[PDB]
Design an enzyme around this catalytic site. Sequence first.
Site, PDB file in Angstrom:
ATOM      1  N   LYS A  36       0.824  -1.197   0.000  1.00 21.53           N
ATOM      2  CA  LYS A  36       0.000   0.000   0.000  1.00 21.53           C
ATOM      3  C   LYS A  36       0.864   1.256   0.000  1.00 21.53           C
ATOM      4  O   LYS A  36       0.519   2.245   0.643  1.00 21.53           O
ATOM      5  CB  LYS A  36      -0.894   0.002   1.239  1.00 21.53           C
ATOM      6  CG  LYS A  36      -2.048  -0.985   1.217  1.00 21.53           C
ATOM      7  CD  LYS A  36      -2.546  -1.155   2.640  1.00 21.53           C
ATOM      8  CE  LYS A  36      -4.057  -0.987   2.772  1.00 21.53           C
ATOM      9  NZ  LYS A  36      -4.423  -0.793   4.214  1.00 21.53           N
ATOM     10  N   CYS A  37       1.991   1.201  -0.702  1.00 23.61           N
ATOM     11  CA  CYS A  37       2.943   2.310  -0.747  1.00 23.61           C
ATOM     12  C   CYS A  37       2.814   3.044  -2.081  1.00 23.61           C
ATOM     13  O   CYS A  37       2.312   2.484  -3.059  1.00 23.61           O
ATOM     14  CB  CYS A  37       4.374   1.782  -0.558  1.00 23.61           C
ATOM     15  SG  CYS A  37       5.700   3.022  -0.620  1.00 23.61           S
ATOM     16  N   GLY A  38       3.263   4.296  -2.113  1.00 22.93           N
ATOM     17  CA  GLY A  38       3.338   5.050  -3.370  1.00 22.93           C
ATOM     18  C   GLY A  38       4.426   4.513  -4.291  1.00 22.93           C
ATOM     19  O   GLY A  38       4.427   4.777  -5.500  1.00 22.93           O
TER      20      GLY A  38
END
Length: 164
Positions: A36-38
């Site tokens: 769930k990271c950029g």
Amino acid sequence: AASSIFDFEVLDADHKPYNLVQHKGSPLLIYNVASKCGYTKGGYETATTLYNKYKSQGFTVLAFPCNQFGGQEPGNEEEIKEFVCTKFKAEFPIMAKINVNGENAHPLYEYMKKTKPGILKTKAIKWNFTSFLIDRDGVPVERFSPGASVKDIEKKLIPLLEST
């Protein structure tokens, strides 16, 4: 003291001991990862692209899930395994979730971080998708920043593959 990454024991995403020493003799790239990271998209795309492109020369990518950066790896290993394969077609080994910083930081990470420090010689992992390039003797030779491109990493990986 420790002379390579092969002096360390790691669990795979199935929580059994992972056969790490099978990668000895050729270079590896080790990521700490999050779902769930950029950097998730770009991170897994770079990792996959490098894995596919250098598979046949004995190169691998290991992914260590870590929830210490904005809590961006909340799911369990089975959920991570599924997400990673469905979205990115990543076929490289996914490991059990770990800490990369602090009192419960995996011994292997403490070794890699000490060997190859970050900004202004600071040891701490700064974010998801930091990677370490490992040589044929299992010694870390580069730390790459989150966001590091295929071409950035090839700059070091190519000369490494041509060695020995």
